[PDB]
Write a protein that binds this ligand. Sequence first.
Ligand SMILES: NCC(=O)Nc1ccc(N)cc1
Ligand SMILES: [Zn+2]
Ligand SMILES: [Zn+2]
Length: 57
Amino acid sequence: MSIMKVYCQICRKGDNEELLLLCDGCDKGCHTYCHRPKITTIPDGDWFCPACIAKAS
Ligand SMILES: NCC(=O)Nc1ccc(N)cc1
Ligand SMILES: [Zn+2]
Ligand SMILES: [Zn+2]
């Protein structure tokens, strides 16, 4: 067995799933409202977290 429950890297809670961005690079989560700067566009498709982009850049 293996269990994955997603938690937001910042506040460390899995609530508000609708505002919880799962990064498709590294599978990590972050609430839009926990982000600095805050996200006000709930992404239309795929999310790459800030850390992943600076690697991919
Ligand atoms: N991995 C992309 C992602 O997380 N997209 C997403 C889309 C809609 C909502 N409400 C939340 C998250
Ligand atoms: Zn959070
Ligand atoms: Zn990532």
